[PDB]
């Protein structure tokens, strides 16, 4: 997986209005504290579609501003994770509903975690 042809034209710029990014090149130790790190900072991450089975993920800021100021400062550096670097890009999509799935149940404990903590859940 290298690229699944994001907005056509004539050059590769990063530049979209949207909210939701899409990473590529991720760690093999990829978590959701660093995805979502990855536009904790520039904004507020809403939503994650982990991805682990080809090392991707995804970020639903809570405004455009935010998703434009990740991938448009990001463009010019390298965010590595894990030590290792990572792929920067505004996703195709514009509405993240991760729902039922492998690769969401792993992600709301991050959402939730940052926002507050309780624990105590007995199994």
């Known amino acids: ?3 699944s042809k994001k907005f056509k034209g ?4 990063a530049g979209v209005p949207s909210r939701v990014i899409h990473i590529r090149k991720l760690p093999i130790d ?3 504290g660093e995805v ?7 904004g507020k991450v809403t939503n994650l579609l982990m991805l682990k089975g080809k090392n991707q993920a995804f970020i639903e800021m809570n405004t455009e501003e935010a998703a434009n100021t990740m991938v448009n400062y990001y463009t010019s550096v390298t965010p590595v ?6 792929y920067i890009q505004f996703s195709n ?4 509903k991760t729902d ?3 690769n969401q149940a792993r992600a709301q404990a991050a959402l939730q975690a940052v926002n507050s903590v309780q624990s105590g859940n007995l199994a």
């Open 36 to 42: 979502i790190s990855l536009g904790l900072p520039f």
């Open 100 to 102: 039922s799935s492998p």
């Open 30 to 32: 990829v978590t959701e």
């Open 10 to 13: 004539d050059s590769r710029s």
């Open 1 to 3: 997986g290298n690229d």
């Open 93 to 96: 999509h514009k509405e993240l």
């Open 81 to 86: 994770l894990r030590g290792q670097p990572i």
